[PDB]
Design a protein around this ligand. Structure first.
Ligand code: NAG
Ligand code: NAG
Ligand code: NAG
Ligand code: NAG
Ligand code: NAG
Ligand code: NAG
Ligand code: NAG
Ligand code: NAG
Ligand code: CA
Ligand code: CA
Ligand code: CL
Ligand code: ZN
Ligand code: ZN
Ligand code: ZN
Ligand code: ZN
Lengths: 695, 695
């Protein structure tokens, strides 16, 4: 029919029931229950009316803790008496004491070992916090157990910095300064992190490789696997996460140097000292880790469902999201999985009455996402030759509500206006916004930092099941969800992230009692897919890309001009990049002018223009990729190696310019800067030339 | 109209006049006369009726000899008196004594130097001829001036082997055993190589990189060029070619070990001794080279003409060929350039009367081909993002007549059938074949070594302006020309290849007096392009690819089974490759069955199927390329690193298996073999799934 029938066919009660269904038993990747959930989801997707549902399985390397040999951290005296022990598991939430197969918290892919030695507080384990240790405080943290805190960076980056500094082991804890909202009670009577709550997650640095043992090719049965000595991204030291009830015991006895400033402090009742070892008599005590987790090749299943396109069955529009969890996944991911179920149940309801999308829709329940985005990456490695020539756009559907204040959208500039349009025709659940549109609430609560009256749309980064589609293949992608207040709350994620307390009751009683903030996210994702696979002309705008390209060029130019003297000695010129951006602007303007003087009743010319729009995003892909990152190939929006969390666009030039005043050879560094300027300008002009008149 | 009007619009007299025009003054790449020829060809192509003709210029690294410091080889005694000197130039052909700007023979990109030392005969400078030198002769040729002979390998491979063996310098000469047909007189009264005739050509090993200073990106003006220390493929020792009048003087005084066998011997009146140094008193004499050629960045222009497609202007069908020569280029390349000019004129004659191709045709007069395929490679590097999605197929047009006996076609298996059909509807110019078709003569003179009644079509290798289009981008390509007798003549190329004697009179009086063997090649290339850009359904057949894939898999398996013991210790299995080939066969059969039950009046489905056919070739492209060769990306037909001249398909597995019994670690070598089997099987299966029914 139209979107007026698809959007009003979604129900909050169906999402509620799907969340209840998916959030009662553990569904860790590679387990029996995850396979049972995959089979049940396949059956339900077949019943809803999908054209074909299949289970694509890959034998990928996963990590599990030993059920007989638990992992724990201890405080060891001179005689090895283990005077302190940390918790082997979190206290199960009420109503879940009899639920079996609950894996204890663990850092996935941590090597086995028994490290012993002194403790060094490292704060957030960033490059800034490791510079200060030896540059300023003269602390050598090599051979010592490094204890960091969650936040401000990815876990893999923390472990990588710890290895680069020579640490024997890594301990992670959730400080109540970053994971405890003020004036809120713990999970049983609130939504704050309890003291036994521990956050899980992998510590892998894959850089878009996927399964570590098969980089570049899928992990089918007839596959040659690298042994675990040349594997991609595996750490070399054991890691284990804890709560702030055991971390207090670990930190309370620390001694040595005082914290450098106030930012090297939290909300615990400890001095937060940095100096290696403990204080006083406790100086004769050290920390001993007991990590027994093992890596093994296990089979993971992705549920791939197809809805054939009526006019262009080879044009693939993908709505994907993962299915595996850590314990229960109340928000991450089953808050998104339940929304996906409703999206392809309303799609199935429209299909039953005889509706067919104009372009083929691929629905995907991925797997092994908490292990390095393995399922989606393997599937896209197996299907790259079809995705490159047939992938119109991708829509990621992870956790639906990390908050309850306002919407948050991260998409490519090609889908900005479309997003805005879809946000204008919808409604807002927020109090004081009844009878309004989601556009008004999203703009007022999240205004653009540059424009006035425009909502803020962030950048598409990495770390979810869109990295392979966007940063390696070059398919336009998009995320939409509901998040916290950007100013009043101001803490990382949500307190119960990757926790055993991330259950259904949390969402039902504290996050989304009426499942309205789930319904709105379901509507935005579904209508994103709907006007991404049914519009005659693809809803893509290149002038937004031109504007953001000019802005990014200005930002990179200012960052470079922060060093004006070296820009003059080695003749570093940004004129090529600015000229490329200007030509992109002009060619985009002329292509948009042709887009409004072209008859749409001709299938062939319509295909020409839609292919131009679809391969616009493809044209920013460098076949050789980024330096030392062959699978990060997006020239504009690839993650930067030096930050990877908040990095500016043009990652090549930003990486070249990063810490440029710290390299021994300045001529070589500025030659690298000039080479990246040349590559960026060539890529921008090449992407502009794809919108030039076709021969 | 049709091909009935385009084929009989070509004339032999127009080709004759174009060949006369293009072969009176020297046109070397990067010179004033080559630029004048480029401008004149641009003007004539505009006059014929091309839709848009432009001059795409790139500043690439070329090599030229010093006009004040000539290069020559001398025999130097103990006192440095230079008792012998080789020729500084070849005797100009009659009627060309007053022609200026004749560059003397030189090996392009040879480093400057004055090496001295003893001479070591090395025969054809292949890997076996260097194996024998120390394995059998106990002869160390490090620090020795290596003298080889043209043939059996590429010049760059000879120089690479010489560097790998430690030679100070390389001397090349044309043996009258390989470049002197029996019973034929020299060029003024025949077509045999004179004593002063010298063959030119580059000695670069670029492996598909293109311009050495800009690998992966075009050489525009805003380009960061690598200095000449990290340049791609540049040799490290001076090289100079000579004729067999001076090589006799160099070789006649040789001494030392006798030649291995009869194959280490030519037609000269010299003992062909291998031993380092000279014999007798001449042992106190050595060889001194005087190489002064310099490398510099020069601007090269490619003439790019566009004839818009009537129905699918996006779809590019390219007819390309280079324009630069060495002295006059009577056959190489202006025998092909004059044919290209006539094909463009015949296309323009139909264009004037109102005919438009269904798909866009790109005509290309490339440049700097004798320097490493630089012009075409730079143009395709600048236009890769359009070629990968719009390049239907490519047609190379180099030298037209390498001989006068029978046709020779080298194409991808997708264009086998079409070629046969085009060869059936044409005529045969050979004597005793009047009133017949080119099919009969081509089959009888060149029968298939496997089938009966089918003409022989060889493999698409490398070394011309199709390597970038085929072995990196993945565009179906084709070559058709006239060559010598495969068995009765049996010598390399033609005697006057890359010579100053390769003039217009040679072709007019000894090779093609009536320009009928030029007309047939013009017709086959023109009709190759015609039913490649005008047929409703792309004239591509996948079952030929399936059959040749089965044959190549059988050949690689038979090569591997020469080591059955190691195939069992390390569990080397080819079952994956054979299963992939079988699935490709089945899916190709089913897709071909859908190709004959599909209504062609629907533009959208026609586009779907033609895109499937066009991207069939693109599906064999590995994004990561071959080991150590990032720009050789065709999985099936890429050149092999160990032979590069006569190597079997599946180059990855062939290079893995090459000299496998000579590696210290056998487990690692067979693991590499298994990895290449896995990659090949995955690529075959993936290319099969592109012809599977769309979602
Ligand atoms: C950057 C730094 O401090 N490196 C030192 C290293 O030189 C020393 O060998 C090692 C032994 O404790 O400790 C660490
Ligand atoms: C024989 C061989 O393979 N290489 C030798 C090398 O060992 C030796 O140092 C050099 C000095 O003449 O000559 C060459
Ligand atoms: C778990 O630990 C026990 C005790 O050391 C051991 O026997 C068992 O093999 C381990 N499980 C593994 C390695 O999967
Ligand atoms: C810590 O755990 C170890 C291992 O079970 C045990 O031997 C030790 O007694 C424990 N110590 C404390 C203080 O709980
Ligand atoms: C939901 O929003 C209201 C409005 O301010 C807030 O008071 C409440 O804490 C929010 N619930 C959460 C964040 O779980
Ligand atoms: C050619 O050689 C002469 C004599 O050594 C020299 O002066 C001139 O610069 C050379 N030409 C070059 C290097 O282009
Ligand atoms: C060889 O050439 C050099 C350089 O011009 C000259 O000095 C010498 O006399 C020549 N020798 C002979 C034998 O021609
Ligand atoms: C052309 O073909 C005839 C027929 O055999 C042959 O005698 C003649 O030598 C050929 N001309 C060449 C090869 O230039
Ligand atoms: Ca993989
Ligand atoms: Ca280049
Ligand atoms: Cl050719
Ligand atoms: Zn998630
Ligand atoms: Zn997660
Ligand atoms: Zn040529
Ligand atoms: Zn040539």
């Amino acid at each position: 029919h139209n979107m007026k029938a698809f959007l009003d066919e979604l129900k909050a009660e169906n999402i509620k029931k799907f969340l209840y269904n998916f959030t009662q038993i553990p569904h860790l990747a590679g387990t029996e229950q995850n396979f049972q959930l995959a089979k049940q989801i396949q059956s339900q997707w077949k019943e809803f009316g999908l054209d074909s549902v299949e289970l694509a399985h890959y034998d990928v390397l996963l990590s599990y803790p030993n059920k007989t040999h638990p992992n724990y951290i201890s405080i060891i005296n001179e005689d090895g008496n283990e005077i302190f022990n940390t918790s082997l598991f979190e206290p199960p939430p009420p109503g879940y004491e009899n639920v079996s197969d609950i894996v204890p918290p663990f850092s996935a892919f941590s090597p086995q070992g028994m490290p012993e030695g002194d403790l060094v507080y490292v704060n957030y384990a960033r490059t800034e916090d490791f510079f200060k240790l030896e540059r300023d405080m003269k602390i050598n943290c090599s051979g010592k157990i490094v204890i960091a805190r969650y936040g401000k960076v990815f876990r893999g980056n923390k472990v990588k910095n710890a290895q680069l500094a020579g640490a024997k082991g890594v301990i992670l804890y959730s400080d109540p300064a970053d994971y405890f909202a003020p004036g809120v009670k713990s999970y049983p009577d609130g939504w704050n992190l309890p003291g036994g709550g521990v956050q899980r997650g992998n510590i892998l640095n894959l850089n878009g490789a996927g399964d570590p043992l098969t980089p570049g090719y899928p992990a089918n049965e007839y596959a040659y696997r690298r042994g675990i000595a040349e594997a991609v991204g595996l750490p070399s030291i054991p890691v284990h996460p804890i709560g702030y009830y055991d971390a207090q015991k670990l930190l309370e006895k620390m001694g040595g140097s005082a914290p450098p400033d106030s930012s090297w402090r939290g909300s615990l009742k400890v001095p937060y000292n940095v100096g290696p070892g403990f204080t006083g008599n406790f100086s004769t005590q050290k920390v001993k880790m007991h990590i027994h987790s093992t890596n093994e090749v296990t089979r993971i299943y992705n549920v791939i469902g197809t809805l054939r396109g009526a006019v262009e069955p080879d044009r693939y529009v993908i709505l994907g999201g993962h299915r595996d969890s850590w314990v229960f996944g109340g928000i991450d991911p089953q808050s998104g999985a339940a929304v996906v179920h409703e999206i392809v149940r309303s799609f199935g309801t429209l299909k039953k009455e005889g509706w067919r999308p104009r372009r083929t829709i691929l629905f995907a329940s991925w797997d092994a996402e908490e292990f390095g985005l393995l399922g989606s990456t393997e599937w896209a490695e197996e299907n790259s030759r079809l995705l490159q020539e047939r992938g119109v756009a991708y829509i990621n559907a992870d956790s639906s509500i990390e908050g309850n204040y306002t919407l948050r959208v991260d998409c490519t500039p090609l889908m900005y206006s479309l997003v805005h349009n879809l946000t204008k025709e919808l409604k807002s659940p927020d109090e004081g916004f009844e009878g309004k549109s989601l556009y008004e609430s999203w703009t007022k609560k999240s205004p653009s930092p540059e424009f006035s009256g425009m909502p803020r749309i962030s950048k598409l980064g990495s770390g979810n099941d869109f990295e392979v589609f966007f940063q390696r293949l070059g398919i336009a992608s998009g995320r939409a969800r509901y998040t916290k207040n950007w100013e009043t709350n101001k803490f990382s994620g949500y307190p119960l992230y990757h926790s055993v307390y991330e259950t259904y009751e949390l969402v039902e009683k504290f996050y989304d009692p009426m499942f309205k903030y789930h319904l709105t996210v379901a509507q935005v994702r579904g209508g994103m897919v709907f006007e991404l696979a049914n519009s005659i002309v693809l809803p893509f705008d290149c002038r937004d890309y031109a504007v953001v390209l000019r802005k990014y060029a200005d930002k990179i130019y200012s960052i470079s001009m922060k060093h004006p003297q070296e820009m003059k000695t080695y003749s570093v010129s940004f004129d090529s990049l600015f000229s490329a951006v200007k030509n992109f602007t002009e060619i985009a303007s002329k292509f948009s002018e042709r887009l409004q003087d072209f008859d749409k009743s001709n299938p062939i010319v319509l295909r020409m223009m839609n292919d131009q729009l679809m391969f616009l995003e493809r044209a920013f892909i460098d076949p050789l990729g980024l330096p030392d990152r062959p699978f990060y190939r997006h020239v504009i929006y690839a993650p930067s190696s030096h930050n990877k969390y908040a990095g500016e666009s043009f990652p090549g030039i930003y990486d070249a310019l990063f810490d440029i005043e710290s390299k021994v050879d300045p001529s070589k560094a500025w030659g690298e800067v000039k080479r990246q300027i040349y590559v960026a300008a060539f890529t921008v002009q090449a992407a502009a030339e794809t919108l030039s008149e076709v021969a």
